C-alpha cells in the first residue's frame, strides 16, 4: 500500500525555526510529485507547493516560497517543509499529499495523503489546566434530567482529553472544542446529562489528562444543595 | 486481449529531453487509435504513409512510441525531410517514415513563472544523426575533432537548455511530442 | 489567479437523498477539476479527478460532471458515511496557482429540537483563585443556529463571553453549545443576578436560566 507518514505535532514559539517531514513508502518515491497543503484553524485547504524528488524541481504555490522551503531527500524517501522564523499565523494543520500525475495539458490532484502534522506557534508556555466542577443544582435540571460537568481552564498547548468515571460513562457526554482565550491559554468544558435520581446513587468523576504537561486530574462533581 | 498502453505513454508524468528521447515498444495488444484521433486536443497530429482515421483498420508487426519535449517552434522539425538543430542533432525521422507525430502544448505542466531549464538539446555535433539514432554523450566538442578539456579555447559543451517560462509566446512554450512508428515486417498490434 | 466558488456552503440532507454540489471556476479550467471529501480531524480524500473520473475505491454513487467553468459533484443516494465537507480543486494551472473552493458541509437533516438549557455559577474553588466563569449549556438542539445572550442585573452583556459548539451527534443528529461568561472575582461580586437567555427556532419564547450570586 501507498503510505505517507508525517512527523509529530509541534509546538513552537514565534521566531523559531522548524522542519517537518513526510516519508513515503509503498511506491517509487522518485516517480511522483509530492507536496504540502496548509489548513489553518477552521479554514479550508491551500496548496503550498510540490516537489519532484530526484529531480531538482520545486514548484511553490502563491507566495509560500518567501516564508517556507520545500525540499526532499530521495535517499530516505522523505519530503520536508521548513520555516526559518515562525509566526503565530503559521499555526495550522499541514498535510503532505502525493500528486497522482498529469494528463493531456494539466494536472491531477492528490491521491494519497499523510495523516497531518499539527503545528502550534505561540508565545505561550506549557501550562496544565485548572479543573473546576460544574455541579448540578436546581438551575441545571430539566424534567428529571440533570446536567453536570467540569470546566478545564487555562492550559497550553492543546490537547486535553476528558473522560467520565474512567470511561464507564460515555452516553450523553459532550466535550466541547477548546477556545483560545485572550491570555493565550485554552479552555474547554465537558458536560454530561444524567437522571437527576442518579445523583444520589452514582458518583461522577471527570478524568482530565493534559499529556503535554503530564497533568492528570480527577475531579468529583458533587451535587449542590440548592 | 489487452489494450495497448497508450495512456502510459501519452499521460506519463515525466518526459525526457529531446537529445535523450525515449522509446517504448508496443506489442501483442489491441490498439484503439480513436483515443487519439477522435480527440480535439493535439496541436500537431500529422501522419506519414498512413491515414490517422484509418488506423483502426490496420495490423502492424510492432508499434514504437518515442517521447520527448521541444519548444513549439521546433515541432515542425519532427517530420520527414527536415533540417535544423533538432532534426539534425537530436531526433531524426527517415524520409520514408510510416507513422504519426503528435504534439501538444504543456505550458502549465512543463513551464513555470520562474522558468524551467531542465529540458536540454544538443546544438553541436560532428555529423547529422541517422534516422532514429540517439546520441546521449556529453563530450566536450572542438571544431577540429580533437579531444579537449573545458575550460579552453575552441572547446565547447555540446548541450544547451530550453528555458520554459509561462509568460513567453507559444512558439517558445514547451510541447510534449510522441512519435508513433508503425512497422510492417506476423502482426501483433491490431485495431479493434 | 483562478477563483473556485462552491454552492451551497452548507446543505442539510437525509440518508437516501440525491445531493448535488456545484463548483464554479473564474475562467475555464477545461477538465482539470478534482473533488475531495474531508471529515473533522482527518485528511482529505480524493473522490473524483479529471472532472468525472472516479478514484479507485470510491463508491460509484459519487459522480462528477462538467467542463470549462461549471462542475457538479452528485451523490446519487446519500449514505451515513457521506456526511462530511466536500472541496473542489482546479489543477488546470501551474502549481503556483492551484486553488481549492471554500468547501460545502453536508450535515444531517432532522426535525427541529429545542435546546435544554442549564446554568452553572462559578465554583467556590475557582472564586478562591480570583476569577468567575459562569457556564450556560444548550443541550441537544437542531438546527445549529442559536443565540445566547448574558444579562447581569438585567443588563445585556457583550464582549465577555465565548461560545463552543459540538459537531453534529452521529446518533441523534443534534448539536450542543456552551457559552462561558468570564469576569474577575471583584466584578462578579459587584452584581447579583446572572442570567443567560437562549433563542432558538425550536423555542416559542426565549428561555432564561438565572441565579442570584450567593443563593446557595
Ligand atoms: C490520458 O488521460 C485522459 C484522462 O483520463 C483519466 O485520467 C487517466 C490518467 C486515466 O486514469 C483515465 O482512466 C481517466 O479517465 C484520458 O481521457 C479520456 O479519453 C477517453 C477516451 O477517448 C474519453 O472518453 C470518451 O469520450 C468519448 C466522447 O466524449 C465517448 O464517445 C467515449 O465513449 C468515451 O467515454 C474521455 O472523455 C477523456 N477524458 C478527458 C478528461 O479528456 C486520455 O484518453 C488519456 N490518453 C490516452 C492516450 O490514453
Residue numbers in the entry:
A (entry chain H): 1 to 52, 52A, 53 to 82, 82A, 82B, 82C, 83 to 100, 100A, ...
B (entry chain A): 320 to 504, 507 to 513
C (entry chain L): 1 to 95, 95A, 95B, 96 to 214
Give verbatim lines from the article.
Here, we report on crystal structures of a cross-neutralizing antibody, CV38-142, in complex with the receptor-binding domains from SARS-CoV-2 and SARS-CoV. The receptor-binding domain (RBD) of the spike protein is highly immunogenic and can induce highly specific and potent neutralizing antibodies (nAbs) against SARS-CoV-2 virus (Barnes et al., 2020a, 2020b; Brouwer et al., 2020; Cao et al., 2020; Ju et al., 2020; Kreye et al., 2020; Piccoli et al., 2020; Robbiani et al., 2020; Rogers et al., 2020; Yuan et al., 2020a; Zost et al., 2020). We report here on a distinct cross-neutralizing epitope in the RBD for an anti-SARS-CoV-2 neutralizing antibody, CV38-142, that cross-reacts with other sarbecoviruses including SARS-CoV-2, SARS-CoV, and SARSr viruses in pangolins and bats. Recognition of the N343 glycosylation site and water-mediated interactions facilitate cross-reactivity of CV38-142 to SARS-related viruses, allowing the antibody to accommodate antigenic variation in these viruses.
Ten of 20 residues differ in the CV38-142 epitope between SARS-CoV-2 and SARS-CoV. To investigate how CV38-142 accommodates these differences, we determined a crystal structure of CV38-142 Fab in complex with SARS-CoV RBD at 1.53 Å resolution. CV38-142 binds SARS-CoV RBD at the same site with an identical approach angle, albeit interacting with some different residues in the RBD. Interaction with the conserved N330 glycan and the conserved N427 and N437 are the same as with SARS-CoV-2. Similar hydrophobic interactions are maintained with I428 in SARS-CoV RBD and L441 in SARS-CoV-2 RBD. However, interactions with K444 are lost in CV38-142 binding to SARS-CoV RBD due a change to the corresponding T431 in SARS-CoV RBD. A hydrophilic surface of CDRH3 of CV38-142 is now juxtaposed to F360 of SARS-CoV RBD compared to S373 of SARS-CoV-2 RBD. The phenyl moiety of F360 adopts heterogeneous conformations with diffuse electron density in the X-ray structure. Side chains of other epitope residues of SARS-CoV RBD that differ from SARS-CoV-2 RBD are well adapted to the binding interface with no clashes or significant changes in the CV38-142 structure. Thus, the overall binding of CV38-142 to SARS-CoV RBD is essentially identical to SARS-CoV-2 despite a few differences in specific interactions.
